[PDB]
Amino acid sequence: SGFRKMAFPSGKVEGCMVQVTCGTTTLNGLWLDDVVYCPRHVICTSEDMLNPNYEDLLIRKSNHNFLVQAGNVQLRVIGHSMQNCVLKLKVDTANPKTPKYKFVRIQPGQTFSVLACYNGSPSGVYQCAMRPNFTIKGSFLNGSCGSVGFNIDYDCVSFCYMHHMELPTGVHAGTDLEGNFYGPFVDRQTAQAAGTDTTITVNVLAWLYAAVINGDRWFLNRFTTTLNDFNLVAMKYNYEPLTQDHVDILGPLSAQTGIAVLDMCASLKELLQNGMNGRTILGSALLEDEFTPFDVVRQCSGVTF
Amino acid sequence: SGFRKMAFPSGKVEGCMVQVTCGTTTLNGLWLDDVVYCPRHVICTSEDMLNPNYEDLLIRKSNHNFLVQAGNVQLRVIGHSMQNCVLKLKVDTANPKTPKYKFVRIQPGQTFSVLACYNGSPSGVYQCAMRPNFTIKGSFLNGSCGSVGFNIDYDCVSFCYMHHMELPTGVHAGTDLEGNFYGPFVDRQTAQAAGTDTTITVNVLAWLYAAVINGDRWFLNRFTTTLNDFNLVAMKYNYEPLTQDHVDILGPLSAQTGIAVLDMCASLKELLQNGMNGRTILGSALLEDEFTPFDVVRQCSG
Ligand SMILES: O=C(Nc1cncc2ccccc12)[C@@H]1CCOc2cc(Cl)c(Cl)cc21
Using CB atoms, which residue from B15, B140, B286 is nearest to A11? Predict the structure, then answer.
């Protein structure tokens, strides 16, 4: 029993974290095989950030300008190239701790674990979701750039996020490991704002199934709804539309608990229109949307890595 | 900016997780140097749950009855001893991945990370607090026994908890790494119940300081209170008494935000009286009590 916000074990990623220093800037890098990946803004000054020409800034740099440190060992940079908003520093040594890995781009609503790092040293791990507005509600301080987000499937680490910046509202923006930003963000000091966020409907439904599996049933009702009527109500409450794909993904949880997805949708509709009335679900007075259906199945069945 | 429930990176503990099998029972063990620590109930059968005599059950066992597996390598048990509710299995190989470590017994309100494991394999990492009733609200299934709780301040792992059992209400009980249970619990299937749980007041106050540091001030008020008047109010909401130790511990956060502890206590009294009125604090509609003053300082300042 119990349902916690749970991250993947971070060990495979910890053995990849290195510190990258360029001039006065120090941030984190991801050391996989003989390449160190890090945000390209490490080559910027405070002035450069206002209007940066990264090809021009990078061409002026030499390999010895990049100081890479893996623990207490300085790595030798033997090449440098840029791929979108990520800098790739070729090093002379392949990381002996390189796990089986892939670079994957996640969709909004998908969750992942973040290994927050400072000076190439892991300090914490937390689970979060890629918001529908492409930001993440992380917890990051100065020096956390280059910290990565990942999932584990079997013994393979799928790297899906690299931290680049904090927006004025305190939310975070970054890229996949190919340097493509999630969202309409750019790595330049200019006016940028997160769009209005919405609730990840499929994830709230998955969390209501987790609550039922854990014995919390007060919100269940005798009713069902059509997918179209549910989506009309979802649009009204700034909830993401629920697709037939989402309904299909929730199938196993529906089969296990005996609550059809549209029956759970009718519970969610009543919760949106009437509130919780002083009650809680899994120790929360708000509907939680940072557990995917896969996360609920994984946690309620005990899959290991 | 931002405030998340954050666990320590679990790598140093992952390299210590092994599978321990004794008869039909399989659970997790912690492999440090040449010793594997695990719950002593791994030696129990069906009739040895209601009233087990662990000394008598252990004396009947030989080293070859304990099957220890570290990855895909079977470890050889060369000795066994019991220390309170933990079984210590001496093995013929020292764990090469043994980090710098300590065994620390914690107090209620303290937080720690749990590396939940099944069959010696880590499945997830989450953050817990030792409840005032000495239980933990973990997330554990059958086979999670032997999973450990830890903190990693510096490069040293302080092991503080080993999971032993789930109580009828779905909460969890366990021991420190010396086998001493937290709380009035025993490793017997006898009728046991968690006492009435209370809110960790000092932790809620720390989390209100984290909210102020993060820019949230709506709950602040112009009132202060005496420590005794605060305790008389807070007890009525099943909150733990706030001691002078707790007030002292909150000093650095009070100095940083400019809000005296008793001034923050008056905000907490008002939040208990009024509720949140549709508002949230750090993305929560409930007062959070699983961040200590130490966690808040570390997460907010470094
Ligand atoms: O609690 C137990 N293991 C579990 C742990 N955590 C979570 C669980 C969730 C579901 C089912 C088992 C779970 C075992 C088996 C059941 O009976 C006992 C009894 C005693 Cl006295 C002791 Cl010390 C251990 C156990």
Answer: B15
